[PDB]
Write a protein that binds this DNA or RNA. Sequence first.
RNA 1: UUUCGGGAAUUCUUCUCUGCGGGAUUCCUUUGUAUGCACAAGGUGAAAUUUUGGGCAACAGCAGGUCUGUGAUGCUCCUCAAUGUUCUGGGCGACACGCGCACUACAAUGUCAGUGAGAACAAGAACGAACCUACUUGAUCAAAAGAGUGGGGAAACCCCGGAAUCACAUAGACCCACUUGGGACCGAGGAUUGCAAUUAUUGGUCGCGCAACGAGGAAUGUCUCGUAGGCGCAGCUCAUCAAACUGUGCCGAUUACGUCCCU
Lengths: 184, 71, 102, 65, 143, 139, 119
Amino acid sequence: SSKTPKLFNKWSFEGLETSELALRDHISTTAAYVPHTSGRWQKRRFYKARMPIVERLANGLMFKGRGNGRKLQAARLLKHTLEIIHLLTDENPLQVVVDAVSKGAPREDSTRVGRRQAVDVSPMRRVNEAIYQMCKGAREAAFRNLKSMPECLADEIVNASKGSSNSYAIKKKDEVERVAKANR
Amino acid sequence: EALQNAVMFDKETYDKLRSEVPKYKLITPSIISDRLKIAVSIAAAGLKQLCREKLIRLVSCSSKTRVYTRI
Amino acid sequence: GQTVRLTITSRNAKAVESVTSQLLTRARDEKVTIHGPVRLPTRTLKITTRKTPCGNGTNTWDTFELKIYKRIIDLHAPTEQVKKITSFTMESGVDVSITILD
Amino acid sequence: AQVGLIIKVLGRTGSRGNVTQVRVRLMAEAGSPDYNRTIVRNVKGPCKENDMLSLMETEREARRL
Amino acid sequence: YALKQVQTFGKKKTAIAVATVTKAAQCNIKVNGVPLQQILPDTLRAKIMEAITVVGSKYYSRLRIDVAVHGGGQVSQAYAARQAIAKGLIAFFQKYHNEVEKAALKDKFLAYDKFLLIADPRRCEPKKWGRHSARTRFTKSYR
Amino acid sequence: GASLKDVSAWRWIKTAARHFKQEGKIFVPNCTEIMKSSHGRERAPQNPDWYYIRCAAVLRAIYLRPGVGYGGLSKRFGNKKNYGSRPEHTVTSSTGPLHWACKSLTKLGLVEPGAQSGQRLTRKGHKFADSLAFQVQIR
Amino acid sequence: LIPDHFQHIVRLLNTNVEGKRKVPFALRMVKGVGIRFAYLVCKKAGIDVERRAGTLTAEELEKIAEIIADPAKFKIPDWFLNRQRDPKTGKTEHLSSSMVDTRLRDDLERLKKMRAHRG
RNA sequence: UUUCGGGAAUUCUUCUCUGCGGGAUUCCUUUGUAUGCACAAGGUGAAAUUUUGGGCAACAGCAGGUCUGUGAUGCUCCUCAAUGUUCUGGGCGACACGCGCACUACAAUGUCAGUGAGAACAAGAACGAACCUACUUGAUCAAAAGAGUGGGGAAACCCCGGAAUCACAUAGACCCACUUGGGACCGAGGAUUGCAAUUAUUGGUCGCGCAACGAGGAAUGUCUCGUAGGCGCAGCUCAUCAAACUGUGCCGAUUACGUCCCU
Ligand SMILES: [Mg+2]
Ligand SMILES: [Mg+2]
Ligand SMILES: [Mg+2]
Ligand SMILES: [Mg+2]
C-alpha cells in the first residue's frame, strides 16, 4: 500500500514543472518527505543536478560560522517558509520556488577574456546562481531587523517568481545583464 | 532609528487589534508590530488571546515561531 | 573441582601464538576440559616527540608505538596436574601466570 | 531569447581557463528561417554536450581558439 | 507454535543498530524502548518511517520489531536504525516466504535509496601533525 | 493500559509536578528561593515552581537506571559554562539540590535507600509513575 | 492597559530609571544592584516580576528603597552582600547609589597613604 | 496485551573482542582510439582507480641549527675572597610603543531559564598506604569543600562511559537598543595546592559593567569529501594553573573537477 511522498506530509509533488525549457534537465522534481538525505552528491561533476530542489535550498542556509553544519535547523526554517508562501500566493509552494529558481539568475554575463567580453551562461550555473543570490538577499535583510528569517525568505521567493524588481536576486540580475549588453 | 514602540497597549490600539487584525491575511507578531507600532512582546501576547477566543486560526507553530490567518 | 586460569602476555605476536598453541596441545593430550583460548583486546602504547635535538627548522614529529598481546585459558584440573602441562621450554619474552578462580 | 542545443565542445579557451567554446544548433521552428542553423559561442559555466542555452542575440560569432 | 525470529544490523558512522523481528499478534515498532510516534524531531522521525512507507504498511502487519542503537550521535543513530528495519524485513521474508515477494520488496527499497540496504563506508579522516585538522595547515607569515 | 516510556517525557513531568503542588505535602526547602540550580548557571531559575519540576524529573530519572546516586544525576542536569574571554567547558550540576530532591521524595514514600549503593523506587513509587502515565494518555 | 500614572522615568535613590523595562531589569540601573540582587528585592517586596517599572506606585517605591538600604532586616543572607566585613568598621553591609563610588575612593586613599604596592 | 529486576535455569554467537587468511585485477561492455602502451563512460561490487590516509625514501650540497641533551669531543679561558658548588633574596612577568600567532565578540539562523535523547581515543598507586574513582554524609537549610565506608593492576572499578554542537506542540521571559548583546577593568567576604601565594597560584559568592566593540582601508593565510567550518573530550606539561600542542569522536556544506594570466 505504497503512496507517493509529500513534503512535510503536506505539499504535493504531482504536476511539478518548470516553464523555462532550457532548465528542465537541471532542476530535479523528485518526491521526498524531508530535505535531509545524507548522500554523496559531490562525487562526480553533474551529479548535484539530481539533488531535489528544496534540499538544495536548505544547503544554502548553512553559511556563516554560526550557521555551518546546522541542517536540521535549516529544515525547520523551510517548513515555516513554505506555509507563509502558501498564504501569500494561494498557490502550491513547491511550484512557486521552482518559478523563482527559473528566473533568479542572468542568462548573459561579461568576463575578463576581452576589457570585458559578453558570454553565455551554462544552465548548471544558472540554477546554482539563483539559489545563491536568493539566500544571500534574505540573510542580509534579516540582519538587524524585527522581521524573522522565515518572513524575509518568503518575500524574496515570491518576488523573484513574479519577476518583480523588489527582489534582491532580480535586481542584481538586471544589472549584470545590462552591463553585458554594453560589452557585446 | 528612534523606533518608539510602545510596551503597554493603550485603549486606542486595543480596538485596532480586535477589529482589523482578524481581517488580515498572513498575521504574524512582527507584521502587526509595525502596523500598530508596538513591541513584539505585547504583539505576541495580544495574538495569543485572539487564538483562544477563536477569532483567528493558527497555521504553523513552533517553540519560537507562530503564524496565523483569518477565519 | 577447581578451575585454573592461565594468562599469557607478550610483546611479540608470533611468540604469544606459539606458546598458546602448545599449551592447548598438551592439555588435550592429558584429556582436560578447556575453555578458550580467548583473545583479549590488544593495547598500544604511544609516545610522540619532536625529531630535532634543538629548536630549529620546521616542527616535525615521530610517533613510536608498542603493542601488548594477551590470551587466557581455563582448565579443570588439580594444581599438580596443571604444572606438568605448563612446564616446557617457553620462548624468551613470554610471561605466563597461574591463578585459581572462585 | 531563442534556445540553442550544444552539439560539440571545442575545448576550453581564455586565460585562466574559465570559458568554453562550443557550437550550438538553433532549434527554433521547423519551417521558418534560422532552422538547423549553427553558430559558435563562448559559455561561462560548466557545460557538456546536449546542454541547452538561452541566447539574447543570435548574430555574433566567437573567434576560433 | 514455533518461534519465527530474525536479527539484522545497520551502521552509519560509529552507531550500530541491532533489530530483532518476530511474528506477534499486533504490529509494534520501538527504538530503544520508545514508540515511533514519540521520536523527536519530526525530521528524523520521517526519515525512520521511510522504511515502512516506501514498501507499504501491509507488509508489517503482525511483526514486532525492537531496535537497540549504541554509539554515534543524534543523526547517525536515526540512519542506522532505518537501515536495520529495512534489512530486517528482507531477512524475514527470505526465511519465511518465497523469492518472488522478497525480490519485489528489494528493488523498491533500492529504487528509492541505496543506503536503505547498503552501509555508507565513510569514516573520519585522521589528524596529522603540523595541521589543525585532517587537511588545514598552520598559518604562514612572511614578515 | 499504559506505562512510563509510552508517553511524552515532558507531559509526564509537568503532570507529576502539578500533582505535588496540589497535594501540598512535599517539604520545599527554604533555600530554593535564594539559590541557583548550579554554579554553571548565571541567573536563578525563572519558574517559581522550579523545585516541583526538578523533583518530578528526578523521580523519572530513577525509574530508568535504578541504583543511581547524586553524582550520576549531576551529569544529567549539567550545562556548558561561560567563562568570559576563555573557551567554554562542561560543568556537572551541583549535588546539593539533588540531595534535597531525593530526600523530599523519600519522605513521600516513593524512594528507598537502595540495595547496595544508590537510590531506588519503592513499590508505591512504581505504582505512582504508571498510573500517572495512563492519565497522560487519556489526556 | 495604560494607566494614567505611567511614568517614562521613575526617580529612585537619586537615579533616573527607565519605566519601559520590566521591574527587575529597571532596578539593576541602580549602582549596587545587579540582576541576581534585583530579583531578590522584588520577591521580598511582593511585586510581580512580570510588570513594567513605569506602573509602580509611590508606596511601592518606598518599600523597594527600604529593602535596598537594609537587606539584612528582610532576611537576605550575609554571603549575598557586597561589603561583608568592612576593613575599617567591621560591620557587614550593602553599598548602593553613590556610596559605591565614595567607598571606592576611600579604599584607594587607604592603600596610597600607607604606601602599599597595590596603592 | 504491554512494562520492570546491570529472581533463577537452560542454549546460542546476529551485534563485541582477534592471530592468521580471503577480497580489486582496468576484471567485463561500449567509445573515441593512436596498432602497441593507455584513456572516457558505464557494469560488477563493501570498495573502481596509486581504494583512502600515513611511514620509509637516491646522489650531490648549505661554512643552515645545535659546543643550553649526554660520562660525544680538539684548542683555549677560570680555578679557593673561583666562571666550580650550595644557601638567602631579587629578576627572567617592568611599559600611554611597534610586529607575528591565538582566544572572545559585535546579537533574534540570538541571549536567558527549563526539559529530552545521546560518542570516541585515553589514563590511573613506590607493612600497608602514598594514584584514579563510585556511593552517602555534610543538610532541621549556599556555592565549593570537610569527612566516612568501599572498588580498581585496569574489556573486571570508574561504566549501561548520561560530552558539547543539537532537539522541544516549553502554548516560558526579552523586541532592534551599546539593550537581558559584550565581558574588559576593578572592590569586599571565604575556601583550597604548597616549605613559601605580596612583587606572580587557582576555584566559588555579591557588586562594577558608564571599556572598547554595531562586521573591520591598503594588504594577506588555508583549503576539493565525512573535506572546510562549527563543537566539545582525553593525553602531555603537572603539588597547584591550558586562550598551546598531540590525538579522538559529533554536526556537516558551497564551488571546481580547469588553466598557464600571477607565483
Ligand atoms: Mg608556524
Ligand atoms: Mg557566547
Ligand atoms: Mg549593558
Ligand atoms: Mg585602519
